[PDB]
């Protein structure tokens, strides 16, 4: 196996201790949805009607606090059903419940299939009105990992 | 462990020169030389 093994280079260590190094990943996330609720707390089913009709507010339960106040987030169908978040995240244990409403002039609301478990949600922007407005949006950070090996 | 002799002269300090002597006292009485015999063999001949 000498022709196979010597095709690879070598590396010198100080001792026979197990050794580790740095592992760097990536940053661009979108949060999967856990459930969607109407304005009274009843969870939207897969066979339910349209949710948030006439720009009526509804809730959007995510497993992390990721989006902020006044930010526009989109489902699997980006820019077709944009949701505007009306406030900070209300914690439900570890879950984060944003009371959202639509941001596209949509009168008929979002279908119930685009509000189910496993739908990716990214951030778009945080718009305001041109006068007298107050602060919206926030920022996010990440971290790396590591890996070992043996002798 | 003999200390590293691949150093600049500023890193051959008071404790480095002392560590070379504490090695010769402690470790080596080895008498493993390829062309010369052992000390009990010469002492019998004397």
């Amino acid at each position: 196996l000498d022709t196979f093994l010597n095709s690879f280079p070598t590396r010198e260590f100080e001792d026979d201790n197990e050794y580790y190094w740095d592992v760097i990943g990536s940053s661009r996330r979108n949060i999967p949805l856990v459930e969607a609720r109407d304005e009274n707390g009843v969870v939207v089913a897969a066979n339910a009607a349209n949710v948030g009709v006439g720009t009526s507010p509804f809730y959007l339960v995510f497993p992390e606090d990721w989006f902020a106040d006044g930010e526009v987030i989109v489902g699997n169908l980006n820019q077709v059903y944009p949701f505007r978040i009306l406030g900070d995240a209300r914690m439900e244990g570890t879950n984060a419940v944003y009371k959202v409403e639509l941001m596209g002039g949509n009168t008929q609301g979002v279908p119930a299939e685009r509000l189910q478990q496993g739908e990716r949600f990214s951030i778009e922007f945080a718009p305001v009105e041109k006068e007298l407005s107050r602060k919206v949006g926030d920022v996010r950070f990440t971290s790396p990992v590591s890996m070992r090996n043996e002798w | 462990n003999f200390p590293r002799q691949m150093l600049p002269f500023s890193k051959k300090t008071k404790q480095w020169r002392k560590d070379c002597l504490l090695w010769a006292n402690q470790k080596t009485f080895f008498n493993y030389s390829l062309v010369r015999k052992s000390v009990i063999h010469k002492k019998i001949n004397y």
């Binding site: 690879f8 590396r11 026979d16 050794y19 190094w21 090996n149 043996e150 002798w151 | -």
Partner: protein, 31 residues
């Protein structure tokens, strides 16, 4: 003693990112 020649060595091979190695193995060499 018996005349035994002993030899010993340490080693180890590190694969940093195993996502950059692809293998197609025939199905008779598994399980």
């Amino acid at each position: 003693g018996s005349a035994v020649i002993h030899r010993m060595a340490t080693l180890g091979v590190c694969v940093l990112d195993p996502t950059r190695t692809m293998s197609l193995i025939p199905a008779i060499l598994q399980g």
